Design a binder for this molecule. Sequence first.
Ligand SMILES: O=C(NCCCCNC(=O)c1cccc(O)c1O)c1cccc(O)c1O
Ligand SMILES: [Fe+3]
Length: 288
Amino acid sequence: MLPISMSDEGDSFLVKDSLGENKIPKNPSKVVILDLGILDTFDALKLNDKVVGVPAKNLPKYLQQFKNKPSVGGVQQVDFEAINALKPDLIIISGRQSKFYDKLKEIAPTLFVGLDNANFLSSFENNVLSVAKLYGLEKEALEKISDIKNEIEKAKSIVDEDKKALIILTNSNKISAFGPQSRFGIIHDVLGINAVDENIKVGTHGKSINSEFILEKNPDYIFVVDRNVILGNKERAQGILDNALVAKTKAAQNKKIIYLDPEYWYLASGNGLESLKTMILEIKNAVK
Ligand SMILES: O=C(NCCCCNC(=O)c1cccc(O)c1O)c1cccc(O)c1O
Ligand SMILES: [Fe+3]
């Protein structure tokens, strides 16, 4: 993925990303943020005031300091009229809105901060530093990143080389798998936890699988992202995972079925200073 590139133009920046080129004024004072990871970055940088609009449909329990902000909808039910009425100087999006790119730019300059599945740490830093630049806050961002890298090293040193993990999502009562270089790739790729299957095709919502596949692989850890919470279904992951095939595996045996927090792993996608640090600790605490 093309990184973001910026050129300082005094009162603004000239900014290139994967989708376009925008002029962006320095210190934008009314930002609509449609990536929840970027919304915790604003919190981290003490930029709470500069946000005028949040996706309240999808506001995680972990961002409930953003609870008084106007809503612009949810992340593929984005409400343009909400956005137009708040009159933003900047609109920040990621992959789930890429399809509405021309339209958002109509209202305000529109910055793309997707994460690269293949180069997660490069892109995360890129996104965070690019955003901090607009506010003169690189110093701060950098200190926050450094603390993230030390935690990744801390966590890496405690990983058991002899154990392998399976990443799965649950939706309806359907299971689907992810491996390296996917949207949860950081468990394998950044934290170094070995995959039980290195050869799972990367897909935005994963690839269809069954409890037989899970027993056959017999992973030592199962990490579970429950898509049912985000999307508003009855179904829960606890339910579909508790069967006689699954229970026979090293993971179920050794109480290492791990229900990762979807508002972090599915929604925020770890594209934020707090989310990511939160996320890394969640894995360490899981596998130590
Ligand atoms: O393009 C995407 N979805 C388009 C159709 C939406 C079908 N899904 C849902 O209705 C839904 C609603 C809210 C949040 C989600 O992630 C969703 O998939 C998409 C892109 C990146 C990551 C995702 O996950 C996605 O979905
Ligand atoms: Fe989705």
